[PDB]
């Protein structure tokens, strides 16, 4: 189906403790494949997935040079932000950037992204047209005018439409056995008495990829979202994901509750009940 590539930058000043740190990670769909950390002894863009290791030394040397220069750029951007917001040198501040491309089943670009934040709030974003910007405040409008004057959006449109799509299609091919292979969740319902009159029903989904999933509890076919505790989808550590949903039910009503699991790796949605035997 659809796929995406994303890079995430975090630049963080640490006044009085050290130079500003710069961390970059790259993802194809829900799979991280590269990382860079300016705090490392030898800062290098490094592989984080098996299918990216086959890239030659020119790729890794080029990615490392880019990440080192990007780190210097965002160290300077942190100083500029202090100017725009009239903030002191004493405080620690954070710039975050995420950018990348979404492609459809045809490998055609669906949407490009280039979003920046300052201290965890929207700062400036490339619009869907890949030619204009949206600034969140008057400080970011200063940056916007500079980027309009320097024709920055044209350069990012060229990347998002070209190299982003081309490299993603190539990463998808090199890692086809995992990236284009959907693992359905393995599911079961557990039962945990709270008292002699109440019990928790927990519906589990384990070992699935990609992370998108829908878990819902129904009682006599009626959705129980308001009474369902739904944990965040969480990484298992082996590039698969887990999730559960739980409801507190009165003792004796357990068999009227059904868990419904929707995942693209499934031939069709599941319906689960507590299976005491």
């Amino acid at each position: 189906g659809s796929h995406s590539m994303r890079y995430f930058y975090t630049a963080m000043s640490r006044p009085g403790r050290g130079e500003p740190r710069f961390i970059a990670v790259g993802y194809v769909d829900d799979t991280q494949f590269v990382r860079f950390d300016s705090d490392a002894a030898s800062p290098r863009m490094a592989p984080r997935a098996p299918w990216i290791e086959q890239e030659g030394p020119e790729y890794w040397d080029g990615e490392t040079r880019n990440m080192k220069a990007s780190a210097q750029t965002y160290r300077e951007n942190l100083r500029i932000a202090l100017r725009y917001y009239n903030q002191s040198e004493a405080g620690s501040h954070i710039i975050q950037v995420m950018y990348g491309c979404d492609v459809g089943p045809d490998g055609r670009l669906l949407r490009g992204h280039d979003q920046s934040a300052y201290d965890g709030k929207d700062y400036i974003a490339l619009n869907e047209d890949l030619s204009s910007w949206t600034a969140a405040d008057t400080a970011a409008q200063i940056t916007q005018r500079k980027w309009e004057a320097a024709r920055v959006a044209e350069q990012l449109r060229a990347y998002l439409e070209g190299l982003c799509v081309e490299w993603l299609r190539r990463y998808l091919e090199n890692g086809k056995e995992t990236l284009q292979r959907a693992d359905p969740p393995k599911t079961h319902v557990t039962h945990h008495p709270i008292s002699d009159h109440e019990a928790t029903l927990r519906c589990w989904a384990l070992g699935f990829y990609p992370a998108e999933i829908t878990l819902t509890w129904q009682r006599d076919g009626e959705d129980q979202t308001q009474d369902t505790e739904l944990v965040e989808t969480r990484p298992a550590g082996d590039r698969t994901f887990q999730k559960w949903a739980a409801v507190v039910v009165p003792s004796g009503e357990e068999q009227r509750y059904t868990c419904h699991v929707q995942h693209e790796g499934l031939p069709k949605p599941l319906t689960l009940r507590w299976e005491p035997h």
């Binding site: 890079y7 970059a24 080029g62 990615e63 880019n66 951007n77 500029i80 920055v152 990347y159």
Partner: peptide, 9 residues
């Protein structure tokens, strides 16, 4: 592959 376009604020 990461974008190489420089973003000066």
């Amino acid at each position: 592959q990461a974008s190489q376009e420089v973003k000066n604020w």
